[PDB]
Design a protein around this ligand. Structure first.
Ligand SMILES: COc1cccc2c1C(=O)c1c(O)c3c(c(O)c1C2=O)C[C@@](O)(C(C)=O)C[C@@H]3O[C@H]1C[C@H](N)[C@H](O)[C@H](C)O1
Lengths: 102, 102
């Protein structure tokens, strides 16, 4: 079994990395992820929009419009910084664990 | 760093400790302190809080071994969950790298 809180986290990481590659709109994101996952992850629009409201509510991402009009989502600098801390944070965890194996 | 994220990390480390072998609270705090070379000094209360949840979820059990000490064990479900979870997160790493090919 896997904690649902944990799959929700993974999906967040993947999404944030997509915007890290560059700004994008929802349909392009699921497509990009569906491809990169070779088909195992078909994200549903409804739950995905639900997640993006939280991130914008956290200022981690912003949104805007551009044409063929589509609403694009941007990785904010605050989002950029948080991702750095998180990866650096999680990097220390991997080191803690490796030491434990001694 | 999200406090939510530190609790997850703290959970991962503790479980990886018990994967090394059954242990008691002060032994676990010591092992983590050493493995982090002093950067993570967990207080007794936080482990009890976390272990109460894990014991209730069947992820760990406890037992008295001797000079009395309360030992904590990672159950079979816990091992499987750690296995499944680590497999899970490994899949994410590929999805992301594929995104960079994209
Ligand atoms: C891109 O880095 C991240 C950025 C933000 C959040 C995260 C992560 C992240 O990498 C991450 C994980 O790698 C892992 C987890 C996680 O929550 C995050 C993030 O939240 C959860 C996990 O600890 C389990 C088993 O629950 C396993 C996994 O670590 C992997 C690699 C470790 N070296 C260790 O072997 C562990 C058991 O599995």
């Amino acid at each position: 079994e896997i904690p649902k809180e944990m799959l929700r986290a993974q999906t967040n990481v993947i999404l944030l990395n997509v915007l890290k590659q560059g700004d994008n709109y929802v349909y392009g994101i699921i497509k990009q992820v569906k491809e990169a996952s070779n088909g195992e992850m078909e994200l549903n629009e409804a739950t995905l929009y639900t997640i993006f409201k939280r991130l914008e509510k956290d200022g981690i991402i912003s949104s805007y419009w551009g044409d063929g009009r589509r609403k694009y989502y941007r990785l904010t600098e605050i989002g950029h910084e948080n991702m750095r801390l998180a990866f650096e944070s999680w990097s220390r965890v991997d080191k803690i664990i490796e030491n434990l194996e001694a």
